[model samples]
Target: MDVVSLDKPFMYFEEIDNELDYEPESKLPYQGQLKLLLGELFFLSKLQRHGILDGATVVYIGSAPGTHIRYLRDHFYNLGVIIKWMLIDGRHHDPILNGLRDVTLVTRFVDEEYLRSIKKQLHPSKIILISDVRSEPSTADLLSNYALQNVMISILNPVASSLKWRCPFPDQWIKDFYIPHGNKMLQPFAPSYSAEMRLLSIYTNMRLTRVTKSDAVNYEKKMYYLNKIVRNKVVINFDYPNQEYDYFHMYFMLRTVYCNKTFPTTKAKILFLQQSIFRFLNIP
Candidate 1:
């Protein structure tokens, strides 16, 4: 119990460096995909834990590396669960994504009209949007052009913030942001949303990642502790139509495990820590 109480909460994929044909001189063990990978894993683990991942249709969008997608899937690979994954990247043909037994990779550009075209056939249970698009066309801004329910957003703050997206999300989600922390974080909640309001004040691509006014106070109480309790591990929504195989959940419990280095952390809920990928992250 003593060891448990004092040890910093963290985690990492041990296999990250195993079959390495590279590395030993690399800046990150996984580079730009590190925190994103962990975030996906942590999210997938929650889906599995909650019994929703087996048949979920996950749609991945972006030109970013697919290297981490395998890490996300391998967790349930041998467990006899099957997930239908669709990859939409008009750029960057990552080798790991080739010949995937359970994925469909397309080489076409994505836009609202395109997504709306597949609104029914490709009705994804969980939609993940990650585009390393240049500064002009904001990712989440594209995210809100037209959309689906139960989606995940990962817009790298720095690049995307060079411009801002106005009214970049559905009104339902802002209401979700203000959900009772007792019900939300207590059940994986969001406490200080108001502070998040301030934190997200600068960048406009909040895409369901904003917190409440009061939550800002908590972020302000930044007393680092080995025993720090995490309020939102995975955000959830039980409200769905005949929501049998799925409910809604998204991951943005952001942080990096590598301390003693300068990743230059970006602040808050709808926040991001770009290029600060690390091996382990505490997801409590």
Candidate 2:
């Protein structure tokens, strides 16, 4: 019988049946899971020097009601494996610090209780203040201290509800941006489908952005953008068993994202976790 090598890891699954049989329940190790998520981090950081997953020291500020905080807490702790983060927790005392040893403050001057709550969470070496940009402490040292070379700050949202702390980045900023509904096309660019789409049709769009020489790490610059269809009619340009091929392209693309960052590099890999009991032939 022909054999498939099980040395490399990959996250993308092209077919619904394959993912259903494999994903959301693959018995991969926790360390492996961490590695896969970090692989995604490694990819994003390469594509965008200021990505959150690639161990960037992120200082997030925003309102997270109930489970949203849990989501942030849970996702980020996992994220911290690859990214360093600090959040100005005005909702309660002290800021939430994870991974990288960095810090930031976020609070409206009027909210005294919020300030009191987060005070305990503040790093002993840091200070939290309530004031305008001028009155606030110099971010220059902090900014300069944390070069964009792979480190980035992600603003969750202002308390005004103008911008809530969610996914926190632009849809088309990178190659493939996942979104529901094919009704309004980002045009030319195909949607990378999710579990909901049964791994078919348009589910995501990859945005093309060109970084200029002047564009430093954290320094925001105008980037060139383009879009193109991924799967469906376009095809990944492979043979039969397209699902495996699709997974290959996704991982290859992910590698492209990983290499162009200010952090460690990675290849096409994924975490396979198992939840159910299974029988196995103890073959060495």
Candidate 3:
């Protein structure tokens, strides 16, 4: 039988499945999981630097499952930055999550009433909202009620198709923006002060193309007017067979929004720095 080497310096997200039959039930760790865990740690380090992560409450408004948060808890506990995590997704009713401390799982339909209940229960001081749902009246109302400082919304995969949906957000909310989305393996560009954001499309055959800035105007209007709103915007992208990838992206993107600044570097570039150091020291 042919063997696959696990010692490679680089691996794609898709390769994770072959190495580990990663069911949500199992917690066996792998390289991809570790890389993503490291990414989340990197994000937390940045947040800690900006003085916003200690004892912060994060209310995620998406369908991320419980396994991911459990892994996050494992890493975060050691840092002494215990995050109060409230997950509001209609489909996620995992029993595993119900047992975890500092983790609240809400499986009800998301609406004004639901959000209102959440507001009272959580009483969040600094809120970050991440949405993967279609633009709806309730979603808009949810944001209005919460007054979240940072928001990350998933755009259409083609990105050009996002123009029709961008108008849902009120113009008054436009403060400033970070171009969200990631590369083939889902490593994201750290947002700086650049006017342009890049989107990459990866096909099954591994072909990659960068989306143009002109086509990325779907989340505009408010985003364009954001400079005057005196708020900040940051975005993120990820791929998944496991939950860690998405969890990691959310971490840094939240940090970017909270800090109101980006480092102007990409994750790939950071790995490249490590590679160079390893080669210089004759270490693999």
Decreasing lDDT order of the candidates: 3, 1, 2
Off by over 4 Å in 2: 1-44, 47-56, 61-83, 88-231, 234-249, 256-284
lDDT of 2 by residue, 1-284 (tens): 12233223222221111211112221222332222233323333332443323333333333211212222234445444343334443354222322324333344422335434443444332221111111122334323222221111111111111011011123223222122111110111122222111111111222223332232211111111111112232233332233342343334434433221243324212211111100111111
Query: What CA RMSD would candidate 3 show?
Result: 16.9
Residue 97 error for model 1, in Å? Answer: 1.2
- Please give, for residues 165-275, the per-residue lDDT of candidate 3 as tens digits: 122233334333333333322232222111122122222222222323332343332233222221122222232222232233433343332222234655543444334
**In candidate 1, which residue ranges exceed 4 Å CA deviation?**
1-27, 123-284
Model 1 scores a TM of 0.43
TM-score to true structure, per model: 0.43, 0.25, 0.39
lDDT head-to-head 1 vs 3, winner: 3
What's the distance in Å from true for residue 149, model 1?
10
- Show the lowest summed lDDT stretch of 10 residues, model 3: 155-164
